[PDB]
Structures are given as structure tokens and as C-alpha cells.
Design a protein around this ligand. Sequence first.
Ligand SMILES: NC(=O)c1ccc[n+]([C@@H]2O[C@H](COP(=O)([O-])OP(=O)(O)OC[C@H]3O[C@@H](n4cnc5c(N)ncnc54)[C@H](O)[C@@H]3O)[C@@H](O)[C@H]2O)c1
Ligand SMILES: NC(=O)c1ccc[n+]([C@@H]2O[C@H](COP(=O)([O-])OP(=O)(O)OC[C@H]3O[C@@H](n4cnc5c(N)ncnc54)[C@H](O)[C@@H]3O)[C@@H](O)[C@H]2O)c1
Ligand SMILES: NC(=O)c1ccc[n+]([C@@H]2O[C@H](COP(=O)([O-])OP(=O)(O)OC[C@H]3O[C@@H](n4cnc5c(N)ncnc54)[C@H](O)[C@@H]3O)[C@@H](O)[C@H]2O)c1
Ligand SMILES: NC(=O)c1ccc[n+]([C@@H]2O[C@H](COP(=O)([O-])OP(=O)(O)OC[C@H]3O[C@@H](n4cnc5c(N)ncnc54)[C@H](O)[C@@H]3O)[C@@H](O)[C@H]2O)c1
Ligand SMILES: O[C@H]1[C@H](O)[C@H](O)[C@@H](O)[C@H](O)[C@H]1O
Lengths: 339, 339, 339, 339
Amino acid sequence: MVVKVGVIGTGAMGRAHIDRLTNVLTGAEVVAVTDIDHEAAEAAVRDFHLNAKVYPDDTSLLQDPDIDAVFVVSFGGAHEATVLKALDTDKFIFTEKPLATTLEGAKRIVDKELTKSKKVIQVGFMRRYDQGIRALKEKLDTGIIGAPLVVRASHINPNVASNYSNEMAITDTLIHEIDEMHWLLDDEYTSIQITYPRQSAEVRNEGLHDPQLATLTTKKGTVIQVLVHVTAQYGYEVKLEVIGETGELQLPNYGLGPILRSNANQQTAVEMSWINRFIQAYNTEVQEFIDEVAKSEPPVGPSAWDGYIAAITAAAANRSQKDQETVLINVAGTPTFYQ
Amino acid sequence: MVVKVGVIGTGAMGRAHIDRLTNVLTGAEVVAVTDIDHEAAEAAVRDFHLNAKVYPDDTSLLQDPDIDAVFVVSFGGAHEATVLKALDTDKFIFTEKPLATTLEGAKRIVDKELTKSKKVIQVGFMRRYDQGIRALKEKLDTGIIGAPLVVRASHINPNVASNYSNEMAITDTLIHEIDEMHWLLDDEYTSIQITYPRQSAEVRNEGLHDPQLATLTTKKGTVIQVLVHVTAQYGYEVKLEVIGETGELQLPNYGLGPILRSNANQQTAVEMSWINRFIQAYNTEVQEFIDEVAKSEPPVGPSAWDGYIAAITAAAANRSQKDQETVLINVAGTPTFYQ
Amino acid sequence: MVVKVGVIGTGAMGRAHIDRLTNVLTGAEVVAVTDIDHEAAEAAVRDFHLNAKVYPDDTSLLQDPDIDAVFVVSFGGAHEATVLKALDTDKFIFTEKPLATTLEGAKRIVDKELTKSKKVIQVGFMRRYDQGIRALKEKLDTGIIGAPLVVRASHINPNVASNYSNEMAITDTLIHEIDEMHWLLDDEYTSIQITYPRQSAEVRNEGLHDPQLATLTTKKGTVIQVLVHVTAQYGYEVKLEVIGETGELQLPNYGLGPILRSNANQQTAVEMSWINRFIQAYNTEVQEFIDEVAKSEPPVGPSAWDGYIAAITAAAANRSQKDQETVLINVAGTPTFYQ
Amino acid sequence: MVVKVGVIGTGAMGRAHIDRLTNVLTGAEVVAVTDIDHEAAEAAVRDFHLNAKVYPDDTSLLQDPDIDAVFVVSFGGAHEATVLKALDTDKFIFTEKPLATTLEGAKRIVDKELTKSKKVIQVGFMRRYDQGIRALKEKLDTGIIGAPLVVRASHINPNVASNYSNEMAITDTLIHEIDEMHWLLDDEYTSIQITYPRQSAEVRNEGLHDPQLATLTTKKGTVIQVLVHVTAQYGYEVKLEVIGETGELQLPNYGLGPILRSNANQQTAVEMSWINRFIQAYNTEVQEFIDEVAKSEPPVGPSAWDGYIAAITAAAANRSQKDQETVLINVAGTPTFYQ
Ligand SMILES: NC(=O)c1ccc[n+]([C@@H]2O[C@H](COP(=O)([O-])OP(=O)(O)OC[C@H]3O[C@@H](n4cnc5c(N)ncnc54)[C@H](O)[C@@H]3O)[C@@H](O)[C@H]2O)c1
Ligand SMILES: NC(=O)c1ccc[n+]([C@@H]2O[C@H](COP(=O)([O-])OP(=O)(O)OC[C@H]3O[C@@H](n4cnc5c(N)ncnc54)[C@H](O)[C@@H]3O)[C@@H](O)[C@H]2O)c1
Ligand SMILES: NC(=O)c1ccc[n+]([C@@H]2O[C@H](COP(=O)([O-])OP(=O)(O)OC[C@H]3O[C@@H](n4cnc5c(N)ncnc54)[C@H](O)[C@@H]3O)[C@@H](O)[C@H]2O)c1
Ligand SMILES: NC(=O)c1ccc[n+]([C@@H]2O[C@H](COP(=O)([O-])OP(=O)(O)OC[C@H]3O[C@@H](n4cnc5c(N)ncnc54)[C@H](O)[C@@H]3O)[C@@H](O)[C@H]2O)c1
Ligand SMILES: O[C@H]1[C@H](O)[C@H](O)[C@@H](O)[C@H](O)[C@H]1O
């Protein structure tokens, strides 16, 4: 039987999730949408040829007893209230990152969810579903390189829009590494420090420091060094290397495109779009959520607790951005509800 | 509109197609299976959690009016008779390659399909759908390396099953390159020659020569040299390099797994089977077939004519296997029905 | 004690040998030169600040008792007469390839040398000294991929000078693979065949076919497929892949220059000069010859007998070039002198 | 004319330099040796078949007026007194790193050398001669990736001797990157900080922290992150990546050995020996020193001033090791004598 979905926020990512549910993946149908821009909502219904109701607000959508699951794809600051409203229903909830824009918001969600009989929230941290990243985690977990001592990673993006702020270097960009590392390492963070190398001449945005170096430490003592470089020009690239006691593991060359020998060079194209880079991870992530809902079983992907860990760490990082000082992180032990 | 599918042949690839149709692709349901090994048919229904009839043979399955399309996924030598019986019904037909294992068989299929009012057969030449191979063709077609002069290709398998015959090195294996190079170069063949290098000590099948070298020449004078090596031990691999007037294009190494530095070596895993190497291509071709059937429109993928044109070159190569001499090829023009 | 050298032929490669012996390598001194262009010989003395006597021809240089070894670096057609003259002395002889330009010339040399008490000739087939090619041979010889069944090789050159003839595709270019493959495989050739794919638009030379495909067969049954492509435009490149029973070995990309990520590509430079490509091989080859002469031991590099196998094979290829038909090769058993 | 050399310290590296000078490089002869272990000095003369006198100490060796240059290859702690004695002679001086084991001893040597009528000291920082590293610096200096913002490097070593101490992670290992980076970037350091990630289980030496992370900052604001990992097990490896405003540059994998396809993986060998890794750089640096001396010209390699920069920065690093705090660096401007 088909999972009936409502979508709250029908903007760029909302429409892309609608397209996934409608055109790409199996077992779901979007039967309801809402957007504070009523005309965005009508356009979603029209462009994707949906047989769906346009609701005036999230409150009304969430009262429709035929919707099995809701996708919350509104502005980040709008997630917390919408997730809290959806937690008064029995519906499963897929929320894009962040779970909330403040860690207090994220704690409100984790507390209302823990009153429920079962977990219903998955948060859209897609990196965990990326085939290469997953495969590296699985190899690490065999023990073949011993314990992880240091992780080195890069999050490289060619250019940013005029609205991109210094804070978004954490909340839009580093946030992916923030969710990924504790999961990769099965460990908890103890601190984060953001430092600023010399400022690139490519930055055109007031207040934006680029590149940024993030250093995170974990309870077992692993150090994570992430380079965030968002005006890098050359391409979009995610790099990850785990230094172990007895060996190292790293992500391979990404790309399907041909090797060209021409004009005294050998070359391959580099991805320019994060959207294309993570197409597979988004498909896999959403298909898994739908397959869980179809079985009436809780999601198994990143939970509200992961959303809360990410919110606390992002807050610690935004605080570090002010003076480049290390900010301690102490995350409470995970409730068994979320193991 | 959900396409109800029957699958004839539920071994490795029959199972892989059932898996994809059931769990990955959209708009299809497997409702019937058959295999000459009834236990294999029952195992497929159980393992993939199907609600499907198990028919004792293809003729009974084909006479069930509720089936919209059949997949022929039996031993290559069995396709011809099943496809001919299926053409007695109004069902759409996806057959794995080869279309038949002889030229006469392929021609019988084409002669019978031509009597129908609509084309119904798609042949599973998935290489044309592989994103990497497509990206190479696309780059070639820009003219960046000038005209293609020589093509070098490898088709590598780690080992073969006990029913793999010398003739199958052509009809089961080289058949992919026979189809692919015609499509890649938009050109037709004028001859083929098979030669036998030093016989591998790894061969375990009576009568099988391995490796085999195939040289194909085209009308424009491109020479293609294919290495077929089906007892290679190390892995499953497809390599393609196009040598142009002003440059070269090569498919990159396929792999998602990590790079491991350990024990005085840096290494990456090689795939051991087609099942993962070409999963995207299989998914794309089968989704396209299902999408056409859902519209009651002819398939747009490789046709029985492509299968026949391939069989003519394959039959020439089976003739060349006998004395290692060059065999001339000159195929008929495409009938209107197949344009 | 320094090895006193005379150099016969002070053109491009003669000066390069003088420079190696004077400025790079250890244990030798050029004390004599001769060239049919007397002005070039005198310039070689001034240019490299030699304490050396300029002789009017090779006969007179060869009468200098103080010379321990001569380098024959004249036009290929002149090598045979000079090598036969040098063999009337007791001096060691390094001749650049070819040993002689005809197979009968090569045999006169071998027959004359067999009359001597010790072997004194080394032929300048430098591929055997290239570290990359040597490392590949060494790994092959560990048995790790089992027996070699097929070799696929490329000799890629960006453009040729106006004097470059069709026969030079063999005598100047393929000759390196001709000496290399029997050594690599510890085997003897039984045939060679040259075929012409479609002619490249880039060819500006009268009578030149480009590319050419050379197929060699060996006594143990290994088939060698060499692509010779001398108007390739993009670079100078030597490629070598050995297909074994249980694995494969290939040369890595040549070059130490950095990987550049820029402008939506990842790239590395390709060598444009064969001179640059084989700098190390030439140094190592010549240093070994000098080291052997310093000990008054016979050379251990490619011998006059190797020069003879090369000459016979090149003659057979030139004959094949006439009609693209296979030409048999039956090389005599190696005399004890050359084991 | 032949450069006559005396070698002070005939241990592992002293014998390796004697071997270079005698058997590999051109234009030098070892005519005198001394070592505090007289039997080691006598053994070096025998083993290398030198026509050399054995002196009981450096003072007596330095009185030999026939020596043109001395190589100082004793314990690091002995370099300063010996270099100061040598500066009372007119001999050229090649000292292995370090110039001196304190920044004050390095300053003494600089001050003394400044009183002389020519620069005579070269310090054995061989990284600058490595062809790969040089090629990367050359490409960076074209401006093609814009200004360098971040440098990430690794110094990976398989295991250490039982006498390898925590401070040697700086003075024996990191010292190479300490000399290399200011040269690569043409910039001066402003600070260094050493941090200790998780302690590896592979460390067998009391007090040795491994791995160690070193962060250096430069005047223009480039941040350098070096990973030092000396019990890494898998191999010896030097990695270098320069992150620029508009692109990146990285050293390719070291090694000329083949790519092996075998046993479900594609692999290349990793060097286990720092000796073999930098054999080219050592030969090139010493050949360059000898060539300068032969012309009675001052050396052009790393000078006593580079020795001093390295000693100041090493000192700062050893101080940082105490509490993992950032230590400021402010080197005086470079004297004209050393430009
Ligand atoms: N996981 C990822 O990689 C990823 C990628 C892109 C976006 N996202 C997240 O998706 C969310 C949406 O981003 P986007 O790029 O589509 O932004 P967007 O601005 O295009 O779209 C947001 C849509 O939400 C609507 N909206 C806003 N507030 C609402 C409310 N209270 N109720 C209903 N609708 C509301 C807006 O009118 C708009 O149409 C953000 O949280 C973003 O962080 C995640
Ligand atoms: N396109 C590709 O990449 C690709 C990959 C694998 C297989 N194939 C093709 O798929 C077909 C099946 O191969 P496989 O690997 O699954 O082999 P398999 O041996 O695993 O399975 C073949 C199945 O067919 C059954 N069978 C044989 N004759 C039959 C008949 N007359 N009617 C019904 N069932 C019959 C067998 O009992 C068996 O279960 C072959 O044609 C092969 O060439 C294509
Ligand atoms: N092993 C290799 O890869 C390699 C590379 C380059 C050249 N070579 C060989 O080196 C030889 C010279 O080539 P080059 O590139 O230096 O050619 P070149 O034309 O530059 O030099 C040849 C020199 O030989 C002189 N000469 C001609 N006949 C002579 C004679 N009878 N006695 C003395 N001198 C004579 C010429 O006047 C000229 O100075 C050729 O045999 C060539 O095939 C080999
Ligand atoms: N640049 C590089 O990469 C590199 C590499 C290795 C060593 N080094 C340097 O080389 C020097 C020697 O290292 P090594 O590995 O050969 O060590 P080693 O212990 O093998 O040799 C040192 C030798 O010095 C002798 N010696 C000690 N004190 C002496 C003195 N006062 N006078 C004369 N001889 C004395 C010892 O007896 C011994 O034979 C050190 O400074 C080391 O740091 C540099
Ligand atoms: O050689 C195999 C090919 O690689 C696959 O693509 C199928 O055609 C099949 O299993 C053949 O046996």
C-alpha cells in the first residue's frame, strides 16, 4: 500500500522532494501541500501533476487523517514549530535539516518526541546515505586500520550566492560534517574550534570569512580537521580521510565522466553542483524513510537526537566564530528511545 | 498504471531484475514466475516477498491474460523459443541478451515480430544506458579528439559457470561489445576476426578457449580490438579507450569503495560481478521499458533488430573461432518497422 | 680508474652521450671524437670543455691505444661498418640502435663478434633500463599474475618531422617495443603482422600510414598488440599492460608534476618529449656500460644478439607493411657466447 | 677539477654520503675521514675502497690543507662545534641537518659566517631538491591557483627505534616540513602549535606522543596543517596539498611501480623506506654542492640562515609540545649576505 505524504514548504528542496516522491522513488504519493506562499503551493501541484489538496497552513494539513507522513521543507527557522505541531498527530515526520535553528528549539522537539510511544522523526542528513561515505565507514568498522586517530576532511564549493553569511558556513555547509563525523566514528564530540586562515580575495559577501578551518575533538581523543572553502572556484568536492593506527582510508576519486588526453594534459571533469553530487544520497535517504512508513515501523535514519547533537555543535561553532576560541561540547548520553 | 510482469528464468539475473522491479523501480509488480528448476522459481517468490503465481513452464505463464509484460531471463540458448511463443500473445517482451544464440534464431524472431502491428521486444543491451559509457560517447561526439581511429576494449570476468561454452565467449560476452561499438561509433562492421592467445591454466570448462581476442573493423575504417578474458580471477571489469586523431578518451576506473593504505600497499576494491557494476544501467533500461508498457507504446530501447544485427556479427565470430580467420560482415538496412 | 671514451658521431644523441659521460655520470672521460662533419666534432670538444683529440674518421680514432671504449652514435646506416672496424680492436663498443640497418649487417656483426674471446658490444635499447618498465617486469617475474597471456602496449608520439617515412614507424618507433617484449616475456617471436586502421587526417608525410597496429606472437603463445600512433597530437606516451592468468600489471602514468584542480577539471601534464621521458633510462644504461668497462668485464645490457633479433623482427615488420599480411619469424637458438 | 672532501662522522648517513660521492655522483673524491669510533672510520675507508687518511678527530682533519670541503655528518648535537671550527679554515662546509641543536648555536654560526669573505655553508635540507616538490612549487608560483590560503601535509613513517623520543618528532621528522614550507610559500612564520590527538596503541616508546598535529601560520596568513605520524605501519609517505583561492595543487602518489590487478583489488606499492623515497633529492643536493665548490663559488642550497630559521621554529615547536599552546615566532630579517 502507498504512503500518502503531505509536503510543508514547496520551494527548491520541497519541489525536489516532491519530484523524488512522484517521479523517482517507489511507494509514495504526495496528496497535500502547503506553503506560506500560496502560489508556490499551487505551482507544485500543477507542475508535478499532483492529485493533491492545497492547504492554507501546516495546522490544517496536519489534521488530514489520510496523510501518513509529512515532509517539512520550509525555511530552517520554521521547522521547530511545525515539527512540534506534527508531534500532536500520529504522523511520521521527515524534516530537512536543521531540526531547529536553536539548540533550545531542538531540545523542545526531543522532549515532546520522547513522550510518544514510538519514534516518528527522521532528519535530512543525507551524507550518511552516500555510497562512498557509507562504504568508507563500513571498512573502518572492520578494524583493518585500527582505531581512528585523526580525520581530515574538506568541504569545497565553487561560489556562494549573495545571501550567504559567515554563520551559514556552519549551518548550511559544515553542518553535514557535524552530523557525519560522530556517526562515522561512533563517538561523541567534546569541543569545536573555528579558525580563519587568510581571507580569500574571492569573497564578495559582507562578513563572510572563507576559508574556515574547523577542529573537533571526540571523547576517545580523535581529532577532526575540516577545511570549509566555499569560494574555491574550481568545483564542488567532498574529501574524507581517516588516519588509523595501522593504515588510512580515504574516499576515492568521484566521477563517471571520461579521462581526456588532449593538448599536453590528462584530465577529468569535476562536479560543479552539490545537487548532482548527492542525488543518489537523497534518493536513498527518502526511499528508506518511505519504506519504513510503509511497514508502520519507526525510521532508522538520522533522528531528532542527531538533529539535537548537530544543533548543539553548530551553536558551539557559531560561538567559536566570534573569537576563534575552542568551545566545549558536552552532549547528554543518548536516551535509549534513540538507540 | 502498474505493469504486471511475469519473469521466465529466476537465476542470478532473473532475481536481480525481480529485486529491482519490486524494491527500486516504479510502476511494476512481479505477479508470475517460472523456471525449469521449480525450486528456484519458488525461492524467488519467497526471497523477494512476492504475491506471484509459479507456473510450471513458459507456455502456461504466457497464457495468463493478466500479465502485461514478460522478462526472458533464462539461459541464452533458451531465449529464442520463449520469445517466439511470447510473440503469439499481445504482451510486451524484455529479453536479456543475446536475442538468440544463432543468426537463424535471431532472424526467426525478427521475421515473426515484423508480422505484428506494433513492436513489442526490447533486448537488454544495457551498456548503452551506462552513465559512464554515455558520457564518453557524448565527449567523443563533440569532436574534441577528432575522428575515432582505434578502439581498445576489455571485457573481464573472474570466472564462469560450468555451462559456459566456447561459443558463449561470443554470444554471452562479446555480444555486449558487438552491440556497444556500433552504437558508440554510429558505424557498422565490415569484418570480425577471433584469435586465441596462450590458453589460460585457469580454464575449467571443456572446449573453452580463454582469453580470446576479437578484432572488428568498421565501414569508416575504425579498428576495434577487444580482449575477452572470462577466467581472469581478479575481478569483473569493463575497460574502453577511444584513440582519436588529436586525443584519447578512456572510461575511468569504477568504484565507490575506499582507498586503503595498509601493509605496504595502496588499494581499492574491484567489483566481482556485473550485478553491481551495471546496476544503474539495468535500472535505467528496465524503468524505460516499464514506462513504455504503462503507455501501451512500443519500447524505445534496443530492439530485436539490434539483436539480429548483433547476431550476424556474433555468428561471424563463432565462424572465425573455428580457424581464426577473418569473416566478412555486411548487414541489411533497417526495416521501416524498426526505425 | 677513469674509462677513456671516444665518440663516433657528434650529432644530437652523440652530444647527449658526451654530456652524460662528462657532466652527469661517473667514471669516464671523453678523450676523442670524430664526425664526418669535422666542424661538429670540434664544436663538441669546445662545448663540453673536453681534453680530447679530433680525428678525421673512425679508423684513426680506433688506432688510439688509450681509448678503452667507443660510442657509435652516427646515422643508423653507418653503424654496421663502424662496429665491424671497432671489432678489429680490443675496445668495448656501445652502439646506439639499430645494431645495423639490415638483418644481414646485424649477422655480420654477430659472426665477427663470436670470433672474439669476450663479448664487447652493448646496443642502446634503453627501454630495459627504464625504472617503470623494469619494475613491471620484476613484478611479473614474481609469478603474482601467473603466466602472461596477452600484452597490450602503446607507443604514442605527438608529431613527426618531414623525413619520417612509413618504414620508420617500425625502425625508429616500434623498434623499442620489438627489443622490449621478448626480454619482458623471456620468450622468442614467431610472427609479426602490421595492420592499418583508418588513416589519420593529421598525417602530413608522403607514404606514412598512421596509426599502425602491430601484432606479435611468441613461442609460448603470448599475443602482443602494440598501437603505434605518431601524429597523436596530445603528448608522448609509453603504455604497457600485461594480462596474466590470475591478474594484470600496467605501467602507471609517467610524471612527477602536480595534480591541478582548476576550472572544473582535475588534471596532470603529459610529457611532450621522448627525450625527457627517457632521461633516466639513458643515464642508467650508460652508467652500467661504463661500470662494466671499468672492471674489464663484458657488458651485460642488450647485446649484438639482441640487435640481431631486433633487425630480423624489424625486417619482417617492414615486409608486413607492404600488404598487411602476417610474416613468420624464426630466430636461431642463442649461441652460448650470448647466454 | 676534482673536489677533495673530508667526512666527519662515518655512521649511516656519513657512509651514505661517502657512497654518493665515490660511486654515484661526479667530481668529488673522499680523501679524509674521522669518527669518534675510530673503527667505524677505518671500516668506511675499507668498505668504500677509499684512498683516504683516517684522522682521530675533527680538529686534525680540518688541518689537512688538501681538503676542499668537509661534510659534517656526526650526531646533531656535534654539528655546531664542528661547523664553528671549520669556519676558521677556508674550506666549504656541507652539514647535515640540523645546523645546530639550539637557536643560539645556530646564531653563533650565522654570526661567524657573516665575518667571512664568502658564504661557505650548505645545510642538508634535501626536500627542496625533490623533483615532485619542486614541480609543485613551480606550478604554484605561476599564479594558476591564486594565493595560497591553506597547506595540508603529512609526514608518515612506519615505525621508530627504541631511542626515538617525543622531541624527535620535531627535531628529526617535522624539521623537514619546517624548512620546506617557508621556502615553498616564500613567506615567514609567525607561530607554531603542536597538538596531540589520540595516542596510538602502536607506540612502544615512553613519553612519545604519536601522532602529532602541527599548525604553523605565516605572515601573509597562510595556515599550514601537518600530520606527523611515525608509527603509521603501512609505509613511508610524504603528502602535500596547497589550497589556493581559485584551485588546488597536490603531489601525486610517489612511485614508479606497476598497478596490480589481483585478488579483488587494484593496488600500487607504498615505499617502506625514507632512504629510497628521497634518494633523488640527496643525490641532487650533494651534486649541486660539489658543482659549486668545483667553481669556488658559494653554495646555492639551504644556508646557515635557513638553518637558523629551522632551529628557531623547532625550538618553538618543542616549547609548544609541553602544554600544546601556540608559540609565537618572529625571525629577524634576512641579511643581505644570505639573499
Ligand atoms: N539536506 C540538504 O542538503 C538540504 C538541501 C537544500 C535545502 N535543505 C533545507 O530545506 C529547507 C528548504 O530550503 P529550500 O532551499 O527549499 O528553501 P526555499 O526558500 O526555496 O523554500 C522554502 C519554501 O518554504 C516556504 N515556507 C517558508 N516558511 C514556511 C512555513 N512556515 N510554512 C510553510 N511554508 C513555508 C517558503 O515560502 C518557500 O516556498 C531548508 O531547511 C534547507 O535548509 C536541505
Ligand atoms: N545484460 C547483462 O549484463 C546480463 C548479466 C547477467 C546475465 N545476463 C543474461 O541473463 C540470462 C540469465 O543468466 P543468469 O546469469 O541469470 O544465469 P543463471 O544460470 O543464474 O540463471 C538462468 C536460469 O534460467 C533457467 N532456465 C534455463 N532454461 C530455461 C527455460 N527454457 N525456461 C525457463 N527457465 C530456464 C535456469 O534454470 C536458471 O534458473 C542469460 O541470457 C545471461 O546472458 C545478462
Ligand atoms: N636509443 C635511442 O632511443 C636513440 C635515440 C636517439 C638516437 N638514437 C640513435 O643515435 C644515432 C644518431 O642519431 P642522432 O639523433 O644523434 O642523429 P644526428 O643526425 O643528430 O647525429 C648523427 C651524427 O652522425 C654524424 N655521422 C654520420 N655518419 C657518420 C660516420 N660515418 N662517422 C661519423 N659520424 C657520422 C653526423 O654528421 C651527425 O653529426 C642513430 O642511430 C639513432 O637511431 C637512438
Ligand atoms: N637530512 C636528512 O634527511 C638526514 C637523514 C639522516 C640523518 N641526518 C643527519 O645526519 C647526522 C647523522 O645521522 P646518522 O643517522 O648517520 O647517525 P649515526 O648514528 O648512524 O652516525 C653518527 C656517527 O657520528 C659519529 N660521531 C658522533 N659524534 C661525533 C663527533 N663528535 N665527531 C665525529 N663523529 C661523531 C658516531 O660515532 C656515528 O658513527 C645527524 O645530524 C642526522 O640528523 C639527516
Ligand atoms: O560475460 C558475462 C557479461 O559480463 C555479463 O554482462 C552478461 O552478459 C553475462 O553474465 C556474461 O556471461
